[PDB]
Swiss-Prot record, chain A:
Residue ranges, annotated region (WD repeat beta-propeller A): 13-356
Identification of the protein by name: DNA damage-binding protein 1
Species for this entry: Homo sapiens
Domain notes for this protein: The core of the protein consists of three WD40 beta-propeller domains.
Source lineage: Eukaryota, Metazoa, Chordata, Craniata, Vertebrata
Entry GO MF terms: cullin family protein binding; damaged DNA binding; DNA binding; protein-containing complex binding; protein-macromolecule adaptor activity; ubiquitin ligase complex scaffold activity; WD40-repeat domain binding
Name of the gene: DDB1
Chief place of localization: cytoplasm
Swiss-Prot record, chain B:
Subcellular location: Virion; Host nucleus; Host extracellular space
Keyword Cell cycle belongs to the record: yes
Region entry Homooligomerization, spans: 1-42
Stretch forming the signal peptide: none
Family: Belongs to the HIV-1 VPR protein family.
Organism this protein belongs to: Human immunodeficiency virus type 1 group M subtype B (isolate NY5)
Keyword list, A-Z: Activator, AIDS, Apoptosis, Cell cycle, Host G2/M cell cycle arrest by virus, Host nucleus, Host-virus interaction, Ion channel, Ion transport, Modulation of host cell cycle by virus, Phosphoprotein, Transcription, Transcription regulation, Transport, Viral penetration into host nucleus, Virion, Virus entry into host cell
Post-translational modification: Phosphorylated on several residues by host. These phosphorylations regulate VPR activity for the nuclear import of the HIV-1 pre-integration complex.
Recorded GO CC terms: host cell; host cell nucleus; host extracellular space; virion component
Miscellaneous comment in the UniProt entry for this protein: HIV-1 lineages are divided in three main groups, M (for Major), O (for Outlier), and N (for New, or Non-M, Non-O). The vast majority of strains found worldwide belong to the group M. Group O seems to be endemic to and largely confined to Cameroon and neighboring countries in West Central Africa, where these viruses represent a small minority of HIV-1 strains. The group N is represented by a limited number of isolates from Cameroonian persons. The group M is further subdivided in 9 clades or subtypes (A to D, F to H, J and K).
Name of the protein described by the UniProt record: Protein Vpr
UniProtKB/Swiss-Prot annotation, chain C:
WD repeat intervals: 46-85, 88-129, 131-168, 170-202, 203-245
Source superkingdom: Eukaryota
UniProt remark on domains: The protein kinase-like region mediates the threonine-protein kinase activity.
WD repeat-like region: region residues: 46-245
Assembly information from the UniProt record: Component of the DCX (DDB1-CUL4-X-box) E3 ubiquitin-protein ligase complex, named CUL4A-RBX1-DDB1-DCAF1/VPRBP complex. Interacts with DDB1; the interaction is direct. Also forms a ternary complex with DDA1 and DDB1. Interacts with NF2 (via FERM domain). Component of the EDVP complex, a E3 ligase complex containing DYRK2, EDD/UBR5, DDB1 and DCAF1. Interacts with DYRK2; the interaction is direct. Interacts with RAG1; the interaction is direct. Interacts with LLGL1 and LLGL2. Interacts with histone H3. (Microbial infection) Interacts with HIV-1 virus Vpr protein; the interaction is direct.
Modified residues (Phosphoserine): S270
Motif (DWD box 1): 197-204
Record note on what altering R238A does: Loss of interaction with DDB1, no effect on interaction with TET3
Organism of derivation: Homo sapiens
Outcome reported for the amino acid change (mutating R202A): Loss of interaction with DDB1, no effect on interaction with TET3
Protein name listed in UniProt: DDB1- and CUL4-associated factor 1
Motif DWD box 2 boundaries: 233-240
Curated annotation (Swiss-Prot), chain D:
Reactions that this protein is recorded to catalyse: Hydrolyzes single-stranded DNA or mismatched double-stranded DNA and polynucleotides, releasing free uracil; a 2'-deoxyuridine in single-stranded DNA + H2O = a 2'-deoxyribose 5'-monophosphate in single-stranded DNA + uracil; a 2'-deoxyuridine in double-stranded DNA + H2O = a 2'-deoxyribose 5'-monophosphate in double-stranded DNA + uracil
Identification of the protein by name: Uracil-DNA glycosylase
Medical condition linked: Immunodeficiency with hyper-IgM 5: A rare immunodeficiency syndrome characterized by normal or elevated serum IgM levels with absence of IgG, IgA, and IgE. It results in a profound susceptibility to bacterial infections.
E.C. code: 3.2.2.27
Taxonomic superkingdom: Eukaryota
GO CC annotation: mitochondrion; nucleoplasm; nucleus
Keywords from the named record: Acetylation, Disease variant, DNA damage, DNA repair, Host-virus interaction, Hydrolase, Mitochondrion, Nucleus, Phosphoprotein
Active site: D62 (proton acceptor)
Length: 1133, 74, 331, 221
C-alpha cells in the first residue's frame, strides 16, 4: 500500500567524461560532456564555449566516443550505458528543431557472466573497423561497424589474458591491432593482438610483448609519423614500437599519479598529462628526421604548466584553450600562455563551472528565515572540496528603497545625451507623474522641462535624434535633449484620452479603446502614420523590435476585450496577421514579443494570473505551440531587462517570475520578492546594472542574482568536506574535514598547500590519549600520503572558519550530530571517529567525542571509546543512537555529562546507516538490505519487528512513515519496504515486503526530509536526496487513486515520448541488482510525468485517449484537465 | 510463496509388515559390504539397548542405512 | 585501492563503486570470511536425527532435508516446524535438487532401487518418474527440462515430461575412472563434463580428456562457461590450456554462490571435512577456511547470500552415536 | 497370584538370599520407576496351567517395557497391543508349518499357556522404556531353577531354545531324556538366518505322539 513519486530537483553536476571532434558539422569544433544521465553538446567559439543541445538518457553513459566512419558527413557518436545499452547517435537539426536520431541500437549484455569489477572500456579502431568493449573479464566483445548492424550485434573473442588495465586500438597498422597493459602474477606487461573479424579470433601481434613497470595505468596510442604506444604510470614514461625503445623517468611526475591525457598536437608531438593533484604537464615527443625517409622519436620532454581543477579528463580546444573536466570539483576553462608567468605558471584561469558532486552530506535550514527552506552541502573532494548553499529562487540585492505609494509605472532616462549611464527615473501615478534625478548614488526630485506632471504616464524614456519622449492620459510629448524644451505634441482628433500605449527607439503606438494610432520618431516631430478600428476596446499592445540592427519593429502585438483574442498586426499595415482565440471572459493585461537564445517568442498575461507563450515567426507572423503557464491570481505586467548580455523577461504579479530560455525551452524561475506591480531596468552611475521595482507602496532599486531555478553560493575549503549539522542556537555549522600531508624526512609529515583547517581564526588539536598507542603500531612511512581529519566551525553568514579542531594521528571523523540530550539544556556538537591504519583491513577502535561551541571556542565536553568505527548517530528522544561496525547502540546521556550504553542490537554485518521515527529505528547494512527495530520503553531494549533478507548493498536509508521505509542500493536502485503488522502469521509480520522498486541510476549518499518550496499548507510527504554526480532529488507519497491515475499516465506517456537510443523507460527504471531484474513497482517517475508539459499538444491529446478517473465517480479527462494536475507536481520541488 | 504439498506418496503402509520386510532387504545389502560377524554383533547391541520393540527395529534400520551411506560417499 | 574498509568506504562515496580497484575483492574477502550459526533443525520425534542431505525449497521458505531412512522433510525456515514428511526412497537420501520453479524435485539414494526419482512438488506429492540404476541425478542448467543421471563412469540424459533416457555419454578409452565421478551439465546446457572427458550434448561426441592428476574429483564448469575446474588445475573450455593451479582447491566439493562471486569448497577424506573453504571467484585467491568443528556431511546456500545450511554430525562417527542434525549460518 | 501347582514346588527359592535381594530390588524399583508387568501379571505363566500339565517350554529374555503390554508370558502381549517383531516373526513360521493356522489378529498367547506351553522369560520385571534395566539382578537364577525342576522332575518335554541366550540357558538339559530343539532368535535384528524354516512347532506335535501326549492346537489363541 505504498505509492511514491520521484523527481530530480537538481540535475547531476559532475563531468563523467568529455570528447572533442566534429559532431554538429565537419567544420565546427564540438565539445561534448557526459554528466551521467545527461549529454551536453557545445560549440568551441573564439568567444569561449557556446551551448547547443542537452539531452537526457535512459541510462548512465558508460562509454562516449566520437568516430568518423568511412562514408560519413560529420563524426558519429557511440553511446554505451551501464545497463549495456549500446547505440550510435547522429546530430541532426532542421534549422531550429534540434533532434538526436538513433542510427542503430541494442543491448550488448552477455546472457551469462559477471562484469569486470575494474569497469567498462570502450575503444574504437582509428580506421573505424570495430568497437572494442571490455565489459566482462576474459572476454573481448567486438561490435563490427558494417551498415546492416542496426540491431548492434556483437561477438566475443576469448581474451586469455584476463584483468586488463587498459586497452587502446593501435595507430599505424593494417591489422586492427590492440595494445594493452595486463596484470598477471609475473607483473604488468604490454601485449599486442590483431583482431581478425573474419575468423572472429586474435593473431600475434606486431611487436613482441615487453614488460612494463607495475604502476602502468595508461596506454597512449601515438599517431603517425611516430607510431607505437606511450606507457604512462609514474615514475616512468616509455615508448614501445617494434625494436625502438625510449624510457624517461623525470623527477617531476614522481609525486602524483597521472589520470588523464589529451593530444594537443595531432602528429603526436605535444600531449597534456593531468594528475590527482590537479597539476598540468606537457609531454613532448622530439620528432627526429632520423634519416631516409623514416621519422623516428629522438627523446621525450616533461615540463610543468601549472595547476588546474582535479582533472577527471582534459580536452584541449585550440588557442591554448583547455577544458579541465572535473568530476571531483568545479570544471574549468584554462589558457596556456606561450611565455612564463611571474610564478612560472603558463596556466591562466578563464571560466569556472559549478559542481555539487560528490554530495557527501546534506541538511535543510532557514538561514534568511520564515518558510524559505535552504540546502547546505558537503561538495567535492581534496583541494576541490567546498560547501554549497542551494536556495530556491532568484533574490534581489537592494541598494535604494524610497517611499512612494500607488506607483503606476517606472521608466529610465539619459538626461545628458553625452553619457551612457542613466541619470533619470520617471514614476507614473493615478492622475500624476514624477521625475527622479540620480546625481551619483544620491536620488533627489526634479522636473524635466517639456514633461506634463499633472497627468498619468503610459510611457517615458530617451528616443532617436538626441531626444526624449512622454505618453500621457491626454497627449504624447517630445522633448529635445539640448536644450530641454517641448518639440512636438500628439493630439487625439476629438480631444479623447489615450487608453493603452507602447513605444521603442523610433516607433510609438497609442490606443483610444477601439481607436489604434501609429506614430513615428523624426527630429523635432511626432509623424503620425496610420489608424485601425477594432471589434472591441484594446487591453494591451507591444512594439519591441527583435532583430537585426535596423532599430524598427515590423509588427505589433494586440490584446482585445470580451472575445479574449491575442492578435498580431503588421507595421505600418495594421493587417490582422494572426488571431489566437483564448476564450472565456477573463481579460488580457500585458503582452511582449521577445528573443531568447536566438529564437523569437510572444508572451501574454491574463486578469486571472494565467500566461500564454507562443513561437513568434521571424518574418512570417504566426503563433506556433500554444502553451499555458498559470502564475499569479492578480493580472500580470511584463518587462524586458539585460543581465550579463542576456535579454530576460520579468513578469509582475503577486507571484513574481523571471522568464528566460535554457536549452531552447522556456523557463519560469521565480523571484524572491513579495509582489512587484511594476519593474524597470536601471543602469546609473551610483546604481549600475541594477533595476527599479515598485508595487502598491515603496520603490526599490537594486541588482538581480544570476538567473537560475536555484541559486548556489560556493564556500571553498581547499580540503575534503565530510558531514554537516546546524546548531541553530550557536548560529553556525559543524563540518567534518580531511587534508593530505606527506611523510617527509624532517619529523613526521609536511602539508601540501594551505587549507580551511590551517587558515582558521581559532585553532585546536585533540590532546586525547585513550589508544596507548603502539601497541598497536603504525609502520610509518616513509614518503607516504596520510590523511588529517578536522572538525570545522563555520559562521551562519560570513562562512569564515571561526574554529578548526584537529583529530588524532591516523584518526578519521565519520559522523556528527547537533542536538540537546537527556535532561541537558546545552546544545552539543557530537562526533564519531575511527582509528584507521593503512596496514589493517577494518578498524577495531574509534571514539565518540562531545563538543560545544560556546562563545568563540570549541571545547571537548565528553568522550567515549568504542571498539569499532562510528558509522552513524541519531537524536533518539533525549538518547544518542549509534552504529559501531556490527552493532546498533543506544547511548543514554547522563547528569554526569557522559555517554552510558543502554541497549544493543547485532543482527547486521556492517550497520552503516541510521534513521528514527519516535520508537521505530531503521538500520541499513553493508550488504543485508534493511531492518526495523523499535525501542520497547517498559522492556528497556530493542525488538526486531521485521527484516529484509535481500542482498542489497546500501547507499542510504529513510523512514517514509511508521509502516513504509525507503532505501538506496549500490546498483543505483530505490526500494520501499512495508510492515504488515496485521497478517495472519508471525512469519509474515516479521517480514518487510519490498513493495516499492525503482532503478534511479544515481548513487544516493544523503537522504533528508523537508522541501525547498515555501510551505504554508495533491501529494503528502517530502524527502530530498543528494548523489555523487551532484544530483539533487525528491521523493513524495501518493494515494491509491492518484498512483493508479499517474501510473496509467506513465504507461500512456511512454508510448508517446521518443527515447535517445530507443531505450525503454520501463527497462531503464526496472529494478536491477546482480541477481533480480524485476519491473519497478510502487514508484512514479516524476521526471517522466513533468515531461508531459514539455511535449506537443496533439501528443497530449494522444495521452487522454479514453482516460477515465474515479475522482466510484467517472469524470472524463482532456489535455487541459491534466496540465493542471502536473502543474501542482512541478511546484513541489 | 509458500504452501507444502499433500503426501500422496509411498505411505507406510501396513507398517510392521513393511518394517519387517525393509529390515531384511537392508540386512542383506549390508552384508555385501560388511563382515556378517560385525553386523550381527551390532544387532545384539541394538537388542540389549532397545528390546524386542519396533523402536529398536527402526534403529538398526537407521544404523545400517547410515553406514551404507558413508560407504557410498567413500 | 585501500585495504582498511573504513578508508575504502570513505573513498566509496568519492570514487564509487567499491572505493578504489579490486572492489569489492576486499569486501567479499571480509564478508565471506564470516559465518554465524543462527539455528538447528533436529529430526521430528526421533531421539537421534538422521539427515544426509540439505537443500532449500525453490522459493526458499522451507529448507528441505533428507533422512537416512529414505524420507524427505521440509522444515519451515522461519518457524522451525516440520511442515511435512514424504516417503521417497528405501535408502539414505544422498541428493536433493529442487526444480528452480518449484513444480519438481530430484532425489538420489544409497542402494535402494530406484536410486533416483522426480517428484511432484506443487499441490500433490506424487512420484513422477524413476531412474533406477542412476546413483546421482542433476537438472539441466538453462531452464531445467532434462535430468543428468550418472552411473559410475557413465552419463545418462532424461526428459522430465516423458521420463525417458535420451543419451548415454561414455568412451571407455577416454575414461579417467574418477572415483567420485559426477556428470554435470554446462552453464549453457550444450556441453557435458563426465569422468574428466568434456563432451558435446547435440553431436553426442567427445571433445577432450582433461589429463589425470586427481583420483576422486570429476570437476565442475565455472558459471562463466569459459573455464572448467578439474580438482586443482583450472583449464580453458575452448583452449584446454592450463590457466592456474589452485592447490587450496584440491579434493573439493565446489559450489559457486548465486551471483558466482565466491566459491564454497568442501574438503573430503571418518571421511569428509570438519571445515570448509571459500575463495574469490574473480581471481582464484582463497578467502578463508572455516572449521565448523564438526564432521560435515553436506552444505548448501540460498540465492540471497543470507543462509548457509550444513549437515553436521553431533558426536563421533561410531556406528551407534551418529546424530546428523542441520545447522544454519548467516554471513 | 502365583499358581498353586508351581507354588507347592518352586517355593524353596523365595527364602534364598538371591531371591530376597531380587524382591527388595523390585520393591524399591516400583517405588521409583513404573515396573512391568504389574503385580498380579508378573506370574501368569504359573496361574495358566498345572506344572505337571506342561508339555512344551519356550524360554524368553526380558519383559515388555510398555504400559499394559507385559503380562506373564514370553513373546506375549495383551490386547490391543500389536505383536512385537519376534512374535510377528514367530507367527510367520506357524503359517509355513501348521496347516489350518490363521493370524490370530492379536498378541495374547494365553491360548498356548492354558493348553500346556510354558512361556517363561529369563528376566521377569523391567523399568518403563529402560530396555534390559532389571538385568543381572536375580530373576535369571529363579528361572534357571524353574528350568532345572522341569528337567529333573517332568519327563518327555519339548524345549524350544531360540537364539544364543536361550540356547545357553538350555545347555544343562540332556537331548537323551528330553527333546531340545534349537535354532536362531525370532527377532528380525538377527543377521544370522536360522529360525525361519526350522518347523519347530510341527516337530513339537510329532514328538508328542511318540510320547503319546495330547497334541498342541497351535491355532487356539
Amino acid at each position: 500500500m505504498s505509492y511514491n513519486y520521484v523527481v530530480t530537483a537538481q540535475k547531476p553536476t559532475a563531468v563523467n567524461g568529455c570528447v572533442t571532434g566534429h559532431f554538429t558539422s565537419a567544420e565546427d569544433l564540438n565539445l561534448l560532456i557526459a554528466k551521467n544521465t545527461r549529454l551536453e553538446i557545445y560549440v568551441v567559439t573564439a568567444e569561449g564555449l557556446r551551448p547547443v543541445k542537452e539531452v537526457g538518457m535512459y541510462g548512465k553513459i558508460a562509454v562516449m566516443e566520437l568516430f568518423r566512419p568511412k562514408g560519413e558527413s560529420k563524426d558519429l557518436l557511440f553511446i554505451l550505458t551501464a545497463k549495456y545499452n549500446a547505440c550510435i547517435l547522429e546530430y541532426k537539426q532542421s534549422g531550429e528543431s534540434i533532434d538526436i536520431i538513433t542510427r542503430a541500437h541494442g543491448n550488448v549484455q552477455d546472457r551469462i557472466g559477471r562484469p569486470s569489477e575494474t569497469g567498462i572500456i570502450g575503444i574504437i579502431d582509428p580506421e573505424c573497423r570495430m568497437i572494442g568493449l571490455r565489459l566482462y573479464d576474459g572476454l573481448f566483445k567486438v561490435i563490427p561497424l558494417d551498415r546492416d548492424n542496426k540491431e548492434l550485434k556483437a561477438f566475443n573473442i576469448r581474451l586469455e589474458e584476463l584483468h586488463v588495465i587498459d586497452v587502446k586500438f593501435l595507430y599505424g597498422c593494417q591489422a586492427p591491432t590492440i595494445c594493452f597493459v595486463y596484470q598477471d602474477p609475473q607483473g604488468r606487461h604490454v601485449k599486442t593482438y590483431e583482431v581478425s573479424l573474419r575468423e572472429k579470433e586474435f593473431n600475434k601481434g606486431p611487436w613482441k610483448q615487453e614488460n612494463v613497470e607495475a604502476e602502468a595505468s595508461m596506454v597512449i596510442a601515438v599517431p603517425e609519423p611516430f607510431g607505437g604506444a606511450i606507457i604512462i604510470g609514474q615514475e616512468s614514461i616509455t615508448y614501445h614500437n617494434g625494436d625502438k625503445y625510449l624510457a624517461i623517468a623525470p623527477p617531476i611526475i614522481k609525486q602524483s599519479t597521472i589520470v588523464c591525457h589529451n593530444r594537443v598536437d595531432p602528429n603526436g608531438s605535444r600531449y597534456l598529462l593531468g594528475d590527482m593533484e590537479g597539476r598540468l604537464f606537457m609531454l613532448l615527443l622530439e620528432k627526429e628526421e632520423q634519416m631516409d625517409g623514416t621519422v623516428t622519436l629522438k627523446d621525450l620532454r616533461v615540463e610543468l604548466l601549472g595547476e588546474t581543477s582535479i582533472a577527471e579528463c582534459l580536452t584541449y580546444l585550440d588557442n591554448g584553450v583547455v577544458f579541465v573536466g572535473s568530476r571531483l570539483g568545479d570544471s574549468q576553462l584554462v589558457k596556456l600562455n606561450v611565455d612564463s608567468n611571474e610564478q612560472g605558471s603558463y596556466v591562466v584561469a578563464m571560466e569556472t563551472f559549478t559542481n555539487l558532486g560528490p554530495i557527501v552530506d546534506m541538511c535543510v535550514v532557514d538561514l534568511e528565515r520564515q518558510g524559505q527552506g535552504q540546502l547546505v552541502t558537503c561538495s567535492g573532494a581534496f583541494k576541490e572540496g567546498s560547501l554549497r548553499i542551494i536556495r530556491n529562487g532568484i533574490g534581489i540585492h537592494e541598494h535604494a528603497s524610497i517611499d512612494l505609494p500607488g506607483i503606476k509605472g517606472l521608466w529610465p532616462l539619459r538626461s545628458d545625451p553625452n553619457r551612457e549611464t542613466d541619470d533619470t527615473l520617471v514614476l507614473s501615478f493615478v492622475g500624476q507623474t514624477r521625475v527622479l534625478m540620480l546625481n551619483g548614488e544620491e536620488v533627489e526630485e526634479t522636473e524635466l522641462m517639456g514633461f506634463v506632471d499633472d497627468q498619468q504616464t503610459f510611457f517615458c524614456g530617451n528616443v532617436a535624434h538626441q531626444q526624449l519622449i512622454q505618453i500621457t492620459s491626454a497627449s504624447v510629448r517630445l522633448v529635445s535633449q539640448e536644450p530641454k524644451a517641448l518639440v512636438s505634441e500628439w493630439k487625439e482628433p476629438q480631444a479623447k484620452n489615450i487608453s493603452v500605449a507602447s513605444c521603442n527607439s523610433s516607433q510609438v503606438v497609442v490606443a483610444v479603446g477601439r481607436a489604434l494610432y501609429y506614430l513615428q520618431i523624426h527630429p523635432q516631430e511626432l509623424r503620425q502614420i496610420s489608424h485601425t478600428e477594432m471589434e472591441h476596446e484594446v487591453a494591451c499592445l507591444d512594439i519591441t523590435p527583435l532583430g537585426d540592427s535596423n532599430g524598427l519593429s515590423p509588427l505589433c502585438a494586440i490584446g482585445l476585450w470580451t472575445d479574449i483574442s491575442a492578435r498580431i498586426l503588421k507595421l505600418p499595415s495594421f493587417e490582422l496577421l494572426h488571431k489566437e482565440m483564448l476564450g472565456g471572459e477573463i481579460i488580457p493585461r500585458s503582452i511582449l514579443m521577445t528573443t531568447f537564445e536566438s529564437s523569437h517568442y510572444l508572451l501574454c498575461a491574463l486578469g486571472d494570473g494565467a500566461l500564454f507563450y507562443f513561437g513568434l515567426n521571424i518574418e512570417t507572423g504566426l503563433l506556433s505551440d500554444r502553451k499555458k503557464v498559470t502564475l499569479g491570481t492578480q493580472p500580470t505586467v511584463l518587462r524586458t531587462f539585460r543581465s550579463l548580455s542576456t535579454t530576460n523577461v520579468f513578469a509582475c504579479s503577486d507571484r513574481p517570475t523571471v522568464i528566460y530560455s535554457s536549452n531552447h525551452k522556456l523557463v519560469f524561475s521565480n523571484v524572491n520578492l513579495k509582489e512587484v506591480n511594476y519593474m524597470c531596468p536601471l543602469n546609473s552611475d551610483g546604481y549600475p546594472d541594477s533595476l527599479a521595482l515598485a508595487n502598491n507602496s515603496t520603490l526599490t532599486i537594486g541588482t538581480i542574482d544570476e538567473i537560475q531555478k536555484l541559486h548556489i553560493r560556493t564556500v571553498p575549503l581547499y580540503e575534503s568536506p565530510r558531514k554537516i549539522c546546524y546548531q541553530e542556537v550557536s548560529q553556525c555549522f559543524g563540518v567534518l574535514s580531511s587534508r593530505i600531508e606527506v611523510q617527509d624526512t624532517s619529523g613526521g609529515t609536511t602539508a601540501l598547500r594551505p587549507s580551511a583547517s590551517t587558515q582558521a581564526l581559532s585553532s585546536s588539536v585533540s590532546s586525547s590519549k585513550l589508544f596507548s598507542s603502539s601497541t598497536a603500531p603504525h609502520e610509518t612511512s616513509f614518503g607516504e600520503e596520510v590523511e588529517v581529519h578536522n572538525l570545522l566551525i563555520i559562521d551562519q553568514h560570513t562562512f569564515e572558519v571561526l574554529h578548526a579542531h584537529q583529530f588524532l594521528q591516523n584518526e578519521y571523523a565519520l559522523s556528527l550530530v547537533s542536538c540537546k540530550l537527556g535532561k541537558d539544556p546545552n546544545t552539543y556538537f557530537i562526533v564519531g571517529t575511527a582509528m584507521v591504519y593503512p596496514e589493517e583491513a577494518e578498524p577495531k577502535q574509534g571514539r565518540i567525542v562531545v563538543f560545544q561551541y560556546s562563545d568563540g571556542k570549541l571545547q571537548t565536553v565528553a568522550e567515549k571509546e568504542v571498539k569499532g568505527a562510528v558509522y552513524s548517530m541519531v537524536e533518539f528522544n533525549g538518547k544518542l543512537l549509534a552504529s559501531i561496525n556490527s552493532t546498533v547502540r543506544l547511548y543514554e546521556w547522563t547528569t554526569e555529562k557522559e555517554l552510558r550504553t543502554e541497549c544493543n542490537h547485532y543482527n547486521n554485518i556492517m550497520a552503516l546507516y541510521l534513521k528514527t521515527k519516535g520508537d521505530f529505528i531503521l538500520v541499513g547494512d553493508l550488504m543485508r538490505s534493511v531492518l526495523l527495530l523499535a525501542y520497547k520503553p517498559m522492556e528497556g531494549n530493542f525488538e526486531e519487528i521485521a527484516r529484509d533478507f535481500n542482498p542489497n548493498w546500501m547507499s542510504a536509508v529513510e523512514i517514509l512513515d511508521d509502516d513504509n521505509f525507503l532505501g538506496a542500493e549500490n546498483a543505483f536502485n530505490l526500494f520501499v519496504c512495508q510492515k504488515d503488522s496485521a497478517a495472519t502469521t508471525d512469519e509474515e509480520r516479521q517480514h518487510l515486503q519490498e513493495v516499492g522498486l525503482f532503478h534511479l541510476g544515481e548513487f544516493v549518499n544523503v537522504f533528508c526530509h523537508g522541501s525547498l518550496v515555501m510551505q504554508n499548507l495533491p501529494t503528502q510527504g517530502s524527502v530530498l536526496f543528494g548523489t555523487v554526480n551532484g544530483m539533487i532529488g525528491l521523493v513524495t507519497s501518493l494515494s491509491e487513486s492518484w498512483y493508479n491515475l499517474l501510473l496509467d499516465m506513465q504507461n500512456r506517456l511512454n508510448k508517446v515520448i521518443k527515447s535517445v537510443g530507443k531505450i525503454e523507460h520501463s527497462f531503464w527504471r526496472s529494478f536491477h541488482t546482480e541477481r533480480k531484474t524485476e519491473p519497478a513497482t510502487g514508484f512514479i517517475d516524476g521526471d517522466l510525468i513533468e515531461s508531459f508539459l514539455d511535449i506537443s499538444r496533439p501528443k497530449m491529446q494522444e495521452v487522454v485517449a479514453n482516460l477515465q478517473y474515479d475522482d466510484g465517480m467517472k469524470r472524463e479527462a482532456t489535455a487541459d484537465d491534466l496540465i493542471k494536475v502536473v502543474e501542482e507536481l512541478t511546484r513541489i520541488h | 510463496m509458500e504452501q507444502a504439498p499433500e503426501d500422496q506418496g509411498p505411505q507406510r503402509e501396513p507398517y510392521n509388515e513393511w518394517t519387517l520386510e525393509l529390515l531384511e532387504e537392508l540386512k542383506s545389502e549390508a552384508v555385501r559390504h560388511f563382515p556378517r560377524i560385525w553386523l550381527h554383533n551390532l544387532g545384539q547391541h541394538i537388542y540389549e539397548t532397545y528390546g524386542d520393540t519396533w523402536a529398536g527395529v527402526e534403529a538398526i534400520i537407521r544404523i545400517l542405512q547410515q553406514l551404507l551411506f558413508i560407504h557410498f560417499r567413500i | 585501492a585501500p585495504i582498511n574498509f573504513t578508508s575504502r568506504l570513505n573513498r566509496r562515496a568519492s570514487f564509487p563503486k567499491y572505493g578504489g580497484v579490486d572492489g569489492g575483492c576486499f569486501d567479499r574477502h571480509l564478508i565471506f570470511s564470516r559465518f554465524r550459526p543462527i539455528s538447528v533443525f533436529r529430526e521430528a520425534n526421533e531421539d537421534e536425527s538422521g539427515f544426509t542431505c540439505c537443500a532449500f525449497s525453490a522459493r526458499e521458505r522451507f529448507l528441505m532435508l533428507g533422512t537416512c531412512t529414505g524420507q524427505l522433510k521440509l522444515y519451515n525456515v522461519f518457524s522451525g516446524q516440520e511442515e511435512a514428511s514424504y516417503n521417497c526412497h528405501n535408502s539414505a537420501i544422498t541428493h536433493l535438487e529442487p526444480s528452480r520453479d518449484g513444480s519438481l524435485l530430484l532425489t538420489s539414494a544409497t542402494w535402494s532401487q530406484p536410486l533416483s526419482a522426480l517428484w511432484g512438488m506443487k499441490s500433490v506429492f506424487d512420484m513422477k518418474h524413476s531412474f533406477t540404476e542412476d546413483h546421482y541425478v542433476e537438472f539441466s542448467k538453462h531452464s531445467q527440462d532434462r535430468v543428468i543421471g550418472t552411473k559410475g563412469d557413465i552419463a545418462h540424459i532424461y526428459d522430465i515430461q516423458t521420463g525417458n533416457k535420451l543419451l548415454t555419454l561414455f568412451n571407455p578409452d577416454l575414461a579417467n575412472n574418477y572415483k567420485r565421478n559426477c556428470a554435470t551439465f554446462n552453464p549453457t546446457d550444450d556441453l557435458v563434463l563426465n569422468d574428466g572427458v568434456l563432451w558435446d550434448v547435440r553431436s553426442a561426441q567427445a571433445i577432450h580428456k582433461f589429463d589425470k592428476f586427481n583420483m576422486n574429483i570429476s570437476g565442475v564448469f565455472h558459471p562463466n562457461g569459459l573455464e572448467v575446474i578439474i580438482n586443482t588445475e583450472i583449464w580453458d573450455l575452448r583452449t584446454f590450456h592450463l590457466l592456474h593451479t589452485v592447490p587450496a582447491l584440491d579434493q573439493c566439493r565446489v559450489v559457486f554462490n548465486h551471483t558466482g562471486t565466491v566459491m564454497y569448497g568442501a574438503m573430503l577424506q571418518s571421511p569428509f571435512g570438519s571445515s570448509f573453504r571459500t575463495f574469490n571467484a574473480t581471481d582464484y585467491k582463497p578467502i578463508a577456511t572455516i572449521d565448523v568443528k564438526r564432521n560435515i556431511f553436506d552444505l548448501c546456500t540460498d540465492t540471497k547470500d543470507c543462509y548457509l545450511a550444513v549437515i553436521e554430525n553431533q558426536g563421533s562417527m561410531d556406528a551407534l552415536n551418529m546424530d546428523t542434525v542441520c545447522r544454519l549460518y548467516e554471513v | 497370584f502365583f499358581g498353586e501347582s508351581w507354588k507347592k514346588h518352586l517355593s524353596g527359592e523365595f527364602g534364598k538370599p538371591y531371591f530376597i535381594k531380587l524382591m527388595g530390588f523390585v520393591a524399591e524399583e516400583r517405588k521409583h520407576y513404573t515396573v512391568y508387568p504389574p503385580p498380579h501379571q508378573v506370574f501368569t505363566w504359573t496361574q495358566m496351567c498345572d506344572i505337571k500339565d506342561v508339555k512344551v517350554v519356550i524360554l524368553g529374555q526380558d519383559p515388555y517395557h510398555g504400559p499394559n503390554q507385559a503380562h506373564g508370558l514370553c513373546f506375549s502381549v495383551q490386547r490391543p497391543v500389536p505383536p512385537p517383531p519376534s512374535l510377528e516373526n514367530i507367527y510367520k513360521e506357524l503359517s509355513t508349518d501348521i496347516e489350518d493356522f490363521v493370524h490370530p489378529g492379536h498378541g495374547d498367547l494365553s491360548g498356548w499357556a492354558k493348553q500346556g506351553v510354558l512361556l517363561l522369560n529369563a528376566v521377569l520385571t523391567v523399568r518403563a522404556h529402560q530396555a534390559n534395566s532389571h538385568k543381572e539382578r536375580g530373576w535369571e537364577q529363579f528361572t534357571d531353577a524353574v528350568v532345572s525342576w522341569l528337567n529333573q522332575n517332568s519327563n518327555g518335554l519339548v524345549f524350544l531354545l531360540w537364539g544364543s541366550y536361550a540356547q545357553k540357558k538350555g545347555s544343562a538339559i540332556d537331548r537323551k531324556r528330553h527333546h531340545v530343539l534349537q535354532t536362531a532368535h525370532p527377532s528380525p535384528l538377527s543377521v544370522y538366518r536360522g529360525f525361519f524354516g526350522c518347523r519347530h512347532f510341527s516337530k513339537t506335535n510329532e514328538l508328542l505322539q511318540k510320547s503319546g501326549k495330547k497334541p498342541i492346537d497351535w491355532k487356539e489363541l
